[PDB]
From a paper:
Members of the MenAT family of TA systems in M. tuberculosis encode a toxin with a conserved nucleotidyltransferase (NTase)-like protein domain (DUF1814) and a cognate antitoxin, which can belong to different protein families. We show that MenAT1 can function as a bona fide TA system in vivo in its native host M. tuberculosis. Furthermore, the toxin MenT1 acts as a tRNA NTase in vitro, which transfers CMPs to the 3ʹ end of tRNA acceptor stems without preference for specific tRNAs. MenT1 biochemical activity was fully inhibited by purified MenA1.
Residue numbers in the entry:
A (entry chain C): 2 to 52
B (entry chain B): 2 to 88, 94 to 142, 146 to 193
C (entry chain A): 2 to 89, 92 to 197
Write the structure that this text describes.
Amino acid sequence: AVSVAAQKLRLALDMYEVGEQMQRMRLGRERPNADVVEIEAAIDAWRMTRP
Amino acid sequence: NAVESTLRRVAKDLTGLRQRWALVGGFAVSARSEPRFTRDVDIVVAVANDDAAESLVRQLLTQQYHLLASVEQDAARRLAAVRLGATNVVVDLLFASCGIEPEIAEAAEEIEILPDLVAPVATTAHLIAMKLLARDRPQDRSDLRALVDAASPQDIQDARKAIELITLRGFHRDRDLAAEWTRL
Amino acid sequence: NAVESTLRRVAKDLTGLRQRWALVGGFAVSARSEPRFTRDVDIVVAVANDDAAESLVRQLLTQQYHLLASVEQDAARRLAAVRLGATAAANVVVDLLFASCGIEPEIAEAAEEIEILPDLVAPVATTAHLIAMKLLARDDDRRPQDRSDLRALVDAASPQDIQDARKAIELITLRGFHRDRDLAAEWTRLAAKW
Protein backbone atom coordinates (compact mmCIF):
# COMPACT_ATOMS: atom_id res chain seq x y z
CA ALA A 1 0.00 0.00 0.00
CA VAL A 2 2.57 2.50 -1.25
CA SER A 3 0.78 5.40 -2.93
CA VAL A 4 1.37 6.30 -6.58
CA ALA A 5 3.01 9.57 -5.52
CA ALA A 6 5.28 7.64 -3.15
CA GLN A 7 6.08 5.12 -5.90
CA LYS A 8 7.07 7.97 -8.26
CA LEU A 9 9.21 9.66 -5.52
CA ARG A 10 10.95 6.30 -4.81
CA LEU A 11 11.68 6.00 -8.54
CA ALA A 12 13.15 9.52 -8.56
CA LEU A 13 15.43 8.54 -5.68
CA ASP A 14 16.60 5.57 -7.74
CA MET A 15 17.13 7.96 -10.69
CA TYR A 16 19.34 10.21 -8.51
CA GLU A 17 21.54 7.28 -7.53
CA VAL A 18 21.98 6.23 -11.18
CA GLY A 19 22.75 9.80 -12.21
CA GLU A 20 25.35 10.13 -9.47
CA GLN A 21 26.99 6.89 -10.62
CA MET A 22 26.94 8.05 -14.23
CA GLN A 23 28.57 11.35 -13.25
CA ARG A 24 31.21 9.41 -11.30
CA MET A 25 32.02 7.17 -14.28
CA ARG A 26 32.21 10.16 -16.61
CA LEU A 27 34.50 12.12 -14.30
CA GLY A 28 36.73 9.07 -14.11
CA ARG A 29 36.99 9.03 -17.89
CA GLU A 30 37.56 12.77 -18.17
CA ARG A 31 40.20 12.64 -15.39
CA PRO A 32 41.85 9.24 -15.83
CA ASN A 33 44.78 10.07 -13.54
CA ALA A 34 42.44 11.09 -10.69
CA ASP A 35 42.43 9.00 -7.53
CA VAL A 36 39.24 7.81 -5.84
CA VAL A 37 39.39 10.60 -3.28
CA GLU A 38 39.75 13.20 -6.02
CA ILE A 39 36.78 11.78 -7.89
CA GLU A 40 34.64 11.78 -4.74
CA ALA A 41 35.75 15.36 -4.08
CA ALA A 42 34.60 16.18 -7.61
CA ILE A 43 31.31 14.38 -6.95
CA ASP A 44 30.82 16.44 -3.77
CA ALA A 45 31.52 19.70 -5.61
CA TRP A 46 28.99 18.62 -8.25
CA ARG A 47 26.02 18.42 -5.86
CA MET A 48 26.86 21.83 -4.33
CA THR A 49 26.64 23.64 -7.67
CA ARG A 50 23.18 25.10 -8.71
CA PRO A 51 21.18 23.68 -11.68
CA ASN B 1 21.68 7.24 -1.61
CA ALA B 2 22.85 10.75 -0.73
CA VAL B 3 19.55 12.40 -1.58
CA GLU B 4 17.52 9.91 0.43
CA SER B 5 19.79 10.56 3.40
CA THR B 6 19.42 14.31 3.00
CA LEU B 7 15.63 14.10 2.69
CA ARG B 8 15.37 11.92 5.80
CA ARG B 9 17.59 14.22 7.86
CA VAL B 10 16.04 17.52 6.81
CA ALA B 11 12.53 16.07 7.30
CA LYS B 12 13.38 15.01 10.85
CA ASP B 13 15.07 18.34 11.56
CA LEU B 14 12.28 20.55 10.24
CA THR B 15 9.69 18.40 12.03
CA GLY B 16 11.67 18.50 15.28
CA LEU B 17 11.56 22.30 14.96
CA ARG B 18 7.74 22.06 14.36
CA GLN B 19 8.16 24.02 11.08
CA ARG B 20 5.45 24.45 8.44
CA TRP B 21 7.18 23.02 5.38
CA ALA B 22 6.71 21.17 2.12
CA LEU B 23 8.82 19.40 -0.44
CA VAL B 24 8.80 21.27 -3.75
CA GLY B 25 11.17 21.10 -6.70
CA GLY B 26 12.11 18.05 -8.76
CA PHE B 27 11.17 15.41 -6.20
CA ALA B 28 7.74 16.97 -5.66
CA VAL B 29 7.33 17.31 -9.45
CA SER B 30 8.25 13.62 -9.80
CA ALA B 31 5.66 12.69 -7.16
CA ARG B 32 2.87 14.64 -8.85
CA SER B 33 3.61 13.92 -12.52
CA GLU B 34 6.58 12.20 -14.18
CA PRO B 35 9.74 11.22 -12.28
CA ARG B 36 13.01 12.71 -13.49
CA PHE B 37 16.64 12.80 -12.43
CA THR B 38 16.81 15.44 -9.69
CA ARG B 39 19.67 16.30 -7.37
CA ASP B 40 18.52 19.37 -5.46
CA VAL B 41 16.17 18.98 -2.52
CA ASP B 42 13.98 22.11 -2.44
CA ILE B 43 11.69 22.84 0.51
CA VAL B 44 9.28 25.69 1.16
CA VAL B 45 9.20 26.87 4.80
CA ALA B 46 6.43 29.22 5.93
CA VAL B 47 7.65 31.81 8.43
CA ALA B 48 6.34 35.25 9.25
CA ASN B 49 9.31 37.47 8.39
CA ASP B 50 13.04 37.66 7.80
CA ASP B 51 13.79 37.54 11.53
CA ALA B 52 12.01 34.19 11.82
CA ALA B 53 13.69 32.81 8.70
CA GLU B 54 17.07 33.94 10.03
CA SER B 55 16.31 32.34 13.39
CA LEU B 56 15.53 29.00 11.70
CA VAL B 57 18.71 29.20 9.63
CA ARG B 58 20.81 30.03 12.71
CA GLN B 59 19.36 26.97 14.48
CA LEU B 60 20.10 24.71 11.50
CA LEU B 61 23.71 25.94 11.42
CA THR B 62 24.01 24.45 14.94
CA GLN B 63 22.75 21.08 13.62
CA GLN B 64 25.54 20.38 11.12
CA TYR B 65 24.33 22.42 8.17
CA HIS B 66 26.48 25.12 6.63
CA LEU B 67 25.39 28.11 4.62
CA LEU B 68 26.31 27.81 0.95
CA ALA B 69 24.38 30.82 -0.36
CA SER B 70 21.60 33.22 0.50
CA VAL B 71 19.22 34.73 -2.03
CA GLU B 72 18.54 38.34 -1.07
CA GLN B 73 16.00 40.52 -2.81
CA ASP B 74 14.88 44.16 -2.73
CA ALA B 75 11.51 43.61 -0.98
CA ALA B 76 9.94 43.53 2.47
CA ARG B 77 11.09 39.92 2.78
CA ARG B 78 14.83 40.56 2.09
CA LEU B 79 15.49 36.78 2.46
CA ALA B 80 13.98 34.81 -0.41
CA ALA B 81 15.89 31.58 0.20
CA VAL B 82 19.03 29.93 1.55
CA ARG B 83 21.08 27.07 0.12
CA LEU B 84 22.46 24.76 2.82
CA GLY B 85 24.93 21.89 2.63
CA ALA B 86 25.40 18.86 4.85
CA THR B 87 28.62 19.03 6.87
CA ASN B 88 25.78 14.86 1.16
CA VAL B 89 23.35 17.04 -0.83
CA VAL B 90 22.22 20.64 -1.20
CA VAL B 91 18.99 21.72 0.43
CA ASP B 92 17.36 24.96 -0.69
CA LEU B 93 14.93 26.46 1.84
CA LEU B 94 12.46 28.83 0.20
CA PHE B 95 10.94 31.51 2.44
CA ALA B 96 9.85 34.34 0.13
CA SER B 97 10.68 33.21 -3.41
CA CYS B 98 7.13 33.02 -4.77
CA GLY B 99 5.10 34.77 -2.04
CA ILE B 100 2.67 31.89 -1.40
CA GLU B 101 4.95 29.77 0.78
CA PRO B 102 2.34 29.78 3.62
CA GLU B 103 -0.34 28.41 1.30
CA ILE B 104 2.07 25.83 -0.14
CA ALA B 105 2.95 24.52 3.30
CA GLU B 106 -0.73 24.59 4.49
CA ALA B 107 -2.00 22.65 1.42
CA ALA B 108 0.82 20.12 1.15
CA GLU B 109 -0.10 16.47 1.63
CA GLU B 110 1.85 14.18 3.92
CA ILE B 111 3.26 11.26 1.90
CA GLU B 112 5.03 8.24 3.39
CA ILE B 113 7.84 7.94 0.85
CA LEU B 114 9.80 5.05 2.37
CA PRO B 115 9.63 3.55 5.85
CA ASP B 116 10.44 6.25 8.40
CA LEU B 117 10.45 8.91 5.64
CA VAL B 118 7.37 11.14 5.67
CA ALA B 119 7.24 14.55 4.06
CA PRO B 120 4.52 17.04 3.18
CA VAL B 121 4.59 17.31 -0.63
CA ALA B 122 3.26 20.39 -2.39
CA THR B 123 0.11 20.03 -4.49
CA THR B 124 0.21 19.80 -8.28
CA ALA B 125 -1.48 23.19 -8.50
CA HIS B 126 1.09 24.90 -6.29
CA LEU B 127 3.97 23.33 -8.23
CA ILE B 128 2.38 24.63 -11.44
CA ALA B 129 2.28 28.13 -9.98
CA MET B 130 5.88 27.93 -8.75
CA LYS B 131 7.17 26.56 -12.03
CA LEU B 132 5.28 29.16 -14.06
CA LEU B 133 6.89 31.94 -12.02
CA ALA B 134 10.37 30.43 -12.07
CA ARG B 135 10.23 29.71 -15.83
CA ASP B 136 13.62 30.62 -17.29
CA ARG B 137 16.99 26.85 -15.26
CA PRO B 138 15.59 25.11 -18.35
CA GLN B 139 14.22 22.16 -16.36
CA ASP B 140 11.39 24.41 -15.15
CA ARG B 141 9.73 24.38 -18.58
CA SER B 142 9.90 20.58 -18.68
CA ASP B 143 8.58 20.27 -15.12
CA LEU B 144 5.75 22.64 -15.97
CA ARG B 145 4.78 20.63 -19.08
CA ALA B 146 4.70 17.42 -17.07
CA LEU B 147 2.64 18.99 -14.29
CA VAL B 148 0.08 20.42 -16.71
CA ASP B 149 -0.17 17.07 -18.51
CA ALA B 150 -0.90 15.40 -15.15
CA ALA B 151 -3.22 18.11 -13.83
CA SER B 152 -6.95 17.67 -13.31
CA PRO B 153 -9.42 20.43 -14.23
CA GLN B 154 -9.57 21.30 -10.53
CA ASP B 155 -5.76 21.40 -10.30
CA ILE B 156 -5.81 23.87 -13.18
CA GLN B 157 -8.31 26.16 -11.46
CA ASP B 158 -6.40 25.89 -8.17
CA ALA B 159 -3.18 26.92 -9.99
CA ARG B 160 -5.01 29.97 -11.44
CA LYS B 161 -6.00 31.07 -7.88
CA ALA B 162 -2.43 30.50 -6.60
CA ILE B 163 -1.03 32.60 -9.44
CA GLU B 164 -3.56 35.35 -8.71
CA LEU B 165 -2.29 35.37 -5.12
CA ILE B 166 1.36 35.62 -6.22
CA THR B 167 0.40 38.69 -8.24
CA LEU B 168 -1.74 40.27 -5.52
CA ARG B 169 1.25 40.04 -3.16
CA GLY B 170 3.65 41.63 -5.62
CA PHE B 171 5.81 38.53 -6.27
CA HIS B 172 5.05 38.31 -9.99
CA ARG B 173 8.22 40.19 -11.05
CA ASP B 174 6.17 42.48 -13.32
CA ARG B 175 4.92 39.59 -15.44
CA ASP B 176 1.34 38.81 -16.48
CA LEU B 177 1.20 35.35 -14.98
CA ALA B 178 -2.55 35.21 -15.65
CA ALA B 179 -1.91 35.62 -19.37
CA GLU B 180 0.90 33.06 -19.26
CA TRP B 181 -1.44 30.66 -17.47
CA THR B 182 -4.15 31.05 -20.13
CA ARG B 183 -1.63 29.67 -22.64
CA LEU B 184 -0.71 26.58 -20.61
CA ASN C 1 17.41 0.14 -7.89
CA ALA C 2 14.74 -0.17 -10.57
CA VAL C 3 16.43 2.19 -13.03
CA GLU C 4 19.79 0.38 -12.80
CA SER C 5 18.10 -3.05 -12.93
CA THR C 6 16.31 -2.20 -16.18
CA LEU C 7 19.34 -0.61 -17.88
CA ARG C 8 21.49 -3.63 -17.05
CA ARG C 9 18.81 -6.07 -18.22
CA VAL C 10 17.97 -4.43 -21.55
CA ALA C 11 21.67 -4.01 -22.37
CA LYS C 12 22.30 -7.68 -21.60
CA ASP C 13 19.24 -8.78 -23.58
CA LEU C 14 19.94 -6.77 -26.74
CA THR C 15 23.62 -7.76 -26.70
CA GLY C 16 22.67 -11.42 -26.12
CA LEU C 17 20.40 -11.19 -29.20
CA ARG C 18 23.37 -9.74 -31.14
CA GLN C 19 21.50 -6.61 -32.12
CA ARG C 20 23.04 -3.49 -33.62
CA TRP C 21 21.93 -1.04 -30.98
CA ALA C 22 22.82 2.20 -29.27
CA LEU C 23 21.68 4.09 -26.21
CA VAL C 24 20.14 7.44 -27.16
CA GLY C 25 18.00 10.09 -25.48
CA GLY C 26 18.50 11.25 -21.92
CA PHE C 27 20.53 8.29 -20.75
CA ALA C 28 22.99 8.74 -23.63
CA VAL C 29 23.19 12.49 -22.98
CA SER C 30 23.84 11.64 -19.32
CA ALA C 31 26.84 9.51 -20.28
CA ARG C 32 28.43 12.51 -22.00
CA SER C 33 27.25 15.49 -19.89
CA GLU C 34 25.42 16.38 -16.67
CA PRO C 35 22.69 13.78 -16.04
CA ARG C 36 19.19 14.62 -17.30
CA PHE C 37 16.74 11.75 -17.84
CA THR C 38 13.24 10.42 -17.19
CA ARG C 39 11.80 6.81 -16.83
CA ASP C 40 12.18 6.28 -20.65
CA VAL C 41 15.31 4.35 -21.62
CA ASP C 42 15.61 5.16 -25.34
CA ILE C 43 17.54 2.81 -27.61
CA VAL C 44 18.10 2.83 -31.37
CA VAL C 45 18.09 -0.62 -32.95
CA ALA C 46 19.26 -0.93 -36.55
CA VAL C 47 17.26 -3.68 -38.22
CA ALA C 48 16.90 -4.67 -41.83
CA ASN C 49 13.17 -4.00 -42.27
CA ASP C 50 9.84 -4.02 -40.44
CA ASP C 51 9.78 -7.82 -40.40
CA ALA C 52 13.12 -7.84 -38.55
CA ALA C 53 11.91 -5.20 -36.10
CA GLU C 54 8.73 -7.18 -35.35
CA SER C 55 10.73 -10.38 -34.96
CA LEU C 56 12.95 -8.72 -32.36
CA VAL C 57 9.95 -7.37 -30.44
CA ARG C 58 8.25 -10.79 -30.54
CA GLN C 59 11.45 -12.27 -29.12
CA LEU C 60 11.57 -9.74 -26.31
CA LEU C 61 7.93 -10.48 -25.46
CA THR C 62 9.12 -14.00 -24.57
CA GLN C 63 11.79 -12.43 -22.29
CA GLN C 64 9.41 -10.74 -19.82
CA TYR C 65 8.87 -7.52 -21.76
CA HIS C 66 5.35 -6.23 -22.37
CA LEU C 67 4.34 -4.12 -25.36
CA LEU C 68 2.80 -0.79 -24.33
CA ALA C 69 2.63 1.06 -27.66
CA SER C 70 3.71 0.94 -31.29
CA VAL C 71 4.46 4.06 -33.34
CA GLU C 72 3.67 3.62 -37.03
CA GLN C 73 3.98 5.90 -40.03
CA ASP C 74 3.00 6.03 -43.69
CA ALA C 75 6.43 5.01 -44.96
CA ALA C 76 8.18 1.90 -46.28
CA ARG C 77 9.56 1.45 -42.78
CA ARG C 78 6.12 1.31 -41.21
CA LEU C 79 7.27 0.60 -37.65
CA ALA C 80 9.04 3.65 -36.26
CA ALA C 81 9.30 2.54 -32.63
CA VAL C 82 7.84 0.45 -29.80
CA ARG C 83 7.41 1.19 -26.06
CA LEU C 84 8.12 -1.84 -23.78
CA GLY C 85 7.36 -2.15 -20.12
CA ALA C 86 9.88 -4.17 -18.18
CA THR C 87 7.48 -4.52 -15.20
CA ALA C 88 3.73 -4.25 -14.46
CA ALA C 89 3.27 5.52 -14.15
CA ALA C 90 6.19 4.79 -11.79
CA ASN C 91 7.67 2.17 -14.11
CA VAL C 92 10.92 2.32 -16.07
CA VAL C 93 10.14 1.77 -19.77
CA VAL C 94 12.18 1.03 -22.88
CA ASP C 95 11.61 2.78 -26.21
CA LEU C 96 13.15 0.95 -29.16
CA LEU C 97 13.58 3.24 -32.16
CA PHE C 98 13.80 1.43 -35.51
CA ALA C 99 12.87 4.08 -38.07
CA SER C 100 12.23 7.26 -36.13
CA CYS C 101 15.03 9.33 -37.64
CA GLY C 102 16.17 7.32 -40.68
CA ILE C 103 19.85 7.00 -39.76
CA GLU C 104 19.53 4.16 -37.26
CA PRO C 105 22.12 2.00 -39.10
CA GLU C 106 24.63 4.84 -38.95
CA ILE C 107 23.84 5.51 -35.29
CA ALA C 108 24.48 1.92 -34.28
CA GLU C 109 27.63 1.66 -36.38
CA ALA C 110 29.17 4.87 -34.92
CA ALA C 111 28.13 4.21 -31.35
CA GLU C 112 30.88 4.18 -28.73
CA GLU C 113 31.20 1.52 -26.06
CA ILE C 114 31.15 3.37 -22.72
CA GLU C 115 31.09 1.98 -19.17
CA ILE C 116 28.05 4.05 -18.27
CA LEU C 117 27.67 2.42 -14.83
CA PRO C 118 30.12 0.05 -13.11
CA ASP C 119 30.53 -3.05 -15.29
CA LEU C 120 27.76 -1.86 -17.61
CA VAL C 121 29.42 -1.28 -21.01
CA ALA C 122 26.90 -0.15 -23.59
CA PRO C 123 27.11 1.35 -27.07
CA VAL C 124 26.23 5.02 -26.70
CA ALA C 125 25.31 7.15 -29.69
CA THR C 126 27.85 9.83 -30.62
CA THR C 127 27.26 13.42 -29.56
CA ALA C 128 26.83 14.22 -33.25
CA HIS C 129 23.98 11.74 -33.64
CA LEU C 130 22.37 12.85 -30.36
CA ILE C 131 22.37 16.44 -31.69
CA ALA C 132 20.78 15.36 -34.97
CA MET C 133 18.12 13.28 -33.18
CA LYS C 134 17.29 16.07 -30.70
CA LEU C 135 16.93 18.64 -33.47
CA LEU C 136 14.51 16.31 -35.27
CA ALA C 137 12.50 15.38 -32.18
CA ARG C 138 12.45 18.95 -30.88
CA ASP C 139 8.97 20.08 -29.79
CA ASP C 140 9.32 23.10 -27.50
CA ASP C 141 5.65 22.82 -26.52
CA ARG C 142 5.44 19.15 -25.51
CA ARG C 143 9.15 18.23 -25.10
CA PRO C 144 11.18 21.15 -23.70
CA GLN C 145 13.92 18.74 -22.51
CA ASP C 146 14.97 18.34 -26.22
CA ARG C 147 15.99 22.01 -26.54
CA SER C 148 17.80 21.91 -23.13
CA ASP C 149 19.50 18.64 -24.01
CA LEU C 150 20.51 20.44 -27.25
CA ARG C 151 22.28 23.35 -25.48
CA ALA C 152 24.17 20.81 -23.33
CA LEU C 153 25.13 18.60 -26.26
CA VAL C 154 26.33 21.43 -28.47
CA ASP C 155 28.41 22.77 -25.58
CA ALA C 156 29.86 19.30 -25.00
CA ALA C 157 30.57 18.91 -28.72
CA SER C 158 34.04 18.76 -30.23
CA PRO C 159 34.68 20.18 -33.71
CA GLN C 160 34.37 16.62 -35.06
CA ASP C 161 31.02 16.27 -33.31
CA ILE C 162 29.74 19.46 -34.95
CA GLN C 163 30.88 18.40 -38.41
CA ASP C 164 29.35 14.94 -37.98
CA ALA C 165 26.08 16.39 -36.68
CA ARG C 166 25.80 18.48 -39.85
CA LYS C 167 26.49 15.35 -41.92
CA ALA C 168 23.91 13.36 -39.96
CA ILE C 169 21.26 16.02 -40.56
CA GLU C 170 22.09 15.98 -44.24
CA LEU C 171 21.63 12.20 -44.41
CA ILE C 172 18.34 12.33 -42.50
CA THR C 173 17.17 14.92 -45.02
CA LEU C 174 18.48 13.02 -48.10
CA ARG C 175 16.49 10.02 -46.88
CA GLY C 176 13.37 12.13 -46.43
CA PHE C 177 13.08 11.69 -42.64
CA HIS C 178 13.31 15.42 -41.91
CA ARG C 179 9.54 15.92 -41.66
CA ASP C 180 9.72 18.78 -44.21
CA ARG C 181 11.92 20.87 -41.91
CA ASP C 182 15.33 22.54 -42.29
CA LEU C 183 17.05 21.09 -39.23
CA ALA C 184 20.32 22.94 -39.87
CA ALA C 185 18.51 26.26 -40.09
CA GLU C 186 16.57 25.47 -36.93
CA TRP C 187 19.87 24.74 -35.20
CA THR C 188 21.37 28.03 -36.37
CA ARG C 189 18.34 29.99 -35.10
CA LEU C 190 18.36 28.19 -31.73
CA ALA C 191 22.12 28.57 -31.25
CA ALA C 192 21.93 32.30 -31.98
CA LYS C 193 19.78 32.50 -28.83
CA TRP C 194 22.64 30.87 -26.84
